[PDB]
Write a protein that binds this ligand. Structure first.
Ligand SMILES: O=CN(O)CC[C@@H](c1ccc(Cl)c(Cl)c1)P(=O)(O)O
Ligand SMILES: [Mn+2]
Ligand SMILES: [Mn+2]
Lengths: 379, 359
């Protein structure tokens, strides 16, 4: 009954909330491993003491002089912890490229993979899928957790559409003329060394929803032309599934990541008390409006990248990362982010091949960065 | 496989929509029986000509007051759709349950009045609800295991008198109040709360009601983790009808899906329970149990008919229900037979008829 859980990226927001859910539920879960990057060593050490878990990894080569009591340390240390720790669930909340090999290791162990790491699916694609058994991957992000829940409303052949909700970002309702000369700071993105301003920027450009559509297709096996996005400013409905009879099943809750976290850890069994439920003691309004696709082409661009297939979704994300960073540095304008992604994709015919190995993914990403860097330099 | 369907109350809104679902899906469904009252005789005759079904209850093979019941007894069927109105539905419900066939239940009276009697007559999962709220709940319940259900949340339109005060209600006419009258009085939601308890076996203090004027969300299930699963569609009874007949399989093209190409707002607000106490009274009646929900419904039907005859005001409908229920001390006994139910209803009608005459 007690599930053995490895928490990768234990020091970030998702990691710390999962440990909190586990801490509140020692009857359901037992932490058996922790991993984090060398920059976060001090927090990891505090976590070792608090949990009593000695099976810990420093996920990279950093903090090299401060390692000497850490059982795994070095570039692929998180992957080694996963390969070597008996577990029922691996929560992968590592950020970026660090998350991919641990994902593949996790799947090869036969454990459930509670996946928070976006690169795993977006860059890894079928490399990751080929390693998974049906139902082995359970998503942690709000939208995908909602979808996994709503898909219980019928059989796979009864599914008509998957409908992701989107907040709309800071620029919901704005015209293309209005967005021509917006600044990073106006996007809510105040550039910092963390992923925060980049996540915020992705929300503003709708690239994040583009990424989520890609993940939706890979997770649930639904064609891109049946994955819709609806703007829903309140973010109470986290996503929905429309079935062949006209019925839509939606999942709703006040925003709290502990709900989808708990469900991913405990799948298929729900975790009593993870989050507060919707309260109807107060009058409220849930609004829905179409996405302005002419103004926010990032989502359709993701569909194009996804339809092309293979390493094309890795290209999409790597191109975004470069174009986005350039916008953060004041080197390009806002509309050029998605303009550059499209330019890079148009030049990327060699990268539609399905990845045979991790190196294929890494090669596609390196090529995409170079291409984006050239595109940036030319304006 | 192809399912053989008997449609009781074929000439009404539900029945005709059902026949349309069946005609659109000849590979899934086949009509094998039709039952009608007598008012819309022209429709029944037209239905016979289109379906070819001669096995009809009202050269009519089954006539009388127990005709629909006897149609059920002797026809080979996989599904019986009971869309009859009121008292005419009780016996056909019990007879359909006796055949072992699936009961696609639209007639509220059967469950609400019969209660435990109907439940004893039923095997697990034999009753599949046609009601939009209960169809929604059944689908949303797929979101977890029975042990993970925290609450069932029924949505209510609020009726045309949403916002109105007790004084405002004093001056409504039969045409202003428009089932539709029960919607307006909130007695419908009272009846659906009882129905929900009996269908899904959830305590009354874990069945909530929220007013949702758009009627897009048809109901919701909240689970122990804090997740709420909701069912949404443009208002169209063909959806829950199609699902009831083909349960657990969904029927392609049954209804239009929610279309998000145009902006919309789904509003939620608390029920004004002081102006609309019908639901709390149904909880009182349901918790008391036994024959009390038969009393609840019969008291309504009598008080509602008085309003429709112009004999009483609108706020008197639910007022009389409360009066009859408070005198109903004796009726918190489980009905052993159909006659116990009919005695409860007679008692309720007469006590209601007195209240009407007293004022
Ligand atoms: O199943 C439906 N009913 O029982 C009708 C009554 C409820 C209702 C449901 C949907 C619509 Cl669009 C309308 Cl107008 C009315 P209620 O008014 O009790 O919510
Ligand atoms: Mn998300
Ligand atoms: Mn209803």
């Amino acid at each position: 009954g007690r599930l053995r859980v490895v928490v990768l990226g234990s020091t970030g927001s998702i990691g710390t909330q999962a440990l909190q859910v586990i801490a509140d539920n020692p009857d359901r879960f037992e932490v058996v491993g922790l991993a984090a990057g060398g920059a976060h060593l001090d927090t990891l050490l505090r976590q070792r003491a608090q949990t009593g878990v000695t099976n810990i990894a420093v996920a990279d080569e950093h903090a090299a002089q401060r390692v000497g009591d850490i059982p795994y340390h070095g570039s692929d240390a998180a992957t080694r912890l996963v390969e070597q720790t008996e577990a029922d669930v691996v929560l992968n909340a590592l950020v970026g490229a660090l998350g991919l090999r641990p994902t593949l290791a996790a799947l090869k162990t036969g454990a459930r993979l509670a996946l928070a790491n976006k690169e795993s699916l977006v860059a890894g694609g079928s490399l990751v899928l080929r390693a998974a058994r049906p139902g082995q991957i359970v998503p942690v992000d709000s939208e995908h957790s909602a979808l996994a829940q709503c898909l219980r409303g019928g059989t796979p052949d009864e599914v008509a559409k998957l409908v992701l909700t989107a907040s709309g970002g800071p620029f919901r309702g704005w015209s293309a003329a209005d967005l021509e000369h917006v600044t990073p700071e106006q996007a809510g993105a105040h550039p910092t060394w963390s992923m925060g301003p980049m996540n915020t920027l992705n929300s503003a450009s709708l690239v994040n929803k583009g990424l989520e559509v890609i993940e939706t297709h890979l997770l649930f096996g639904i064609p891109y032309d049946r994955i819709d996005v609806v703007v829903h400013p309140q973010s109470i409905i986290h996503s929905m599934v429309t079935f062949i009879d006209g019925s839509t099943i939606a999942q709703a809750s006040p925003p709290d990541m502990k709900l989808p976290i708990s469900l991913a850890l405990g799948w298929p069994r729900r975790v009593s008390g993870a989050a507060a439920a919707c309260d109807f003691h107060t009058a409220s309004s849930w609004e829905f409006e179409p996405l302005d696709t002419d103004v926010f082409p990032a989502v359709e661009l993701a569909r194009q990248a996804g339809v092309a297939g293979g390493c094309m979704t890795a290209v999409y994300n790597a191109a975004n990362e470069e174009a986005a960073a350039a916008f953060l540095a004041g080197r390009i304008g806002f509309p050029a982010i998605v303009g550059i992604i499209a330019d890079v994709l148009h030049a990327a015919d060699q990268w539609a091949v399905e990845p045979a190995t991790v190196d294929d993914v890494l090669d596609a990403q390196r090529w995409a960065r170079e291409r984006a860097q050239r595109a940036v330099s030319g304006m």
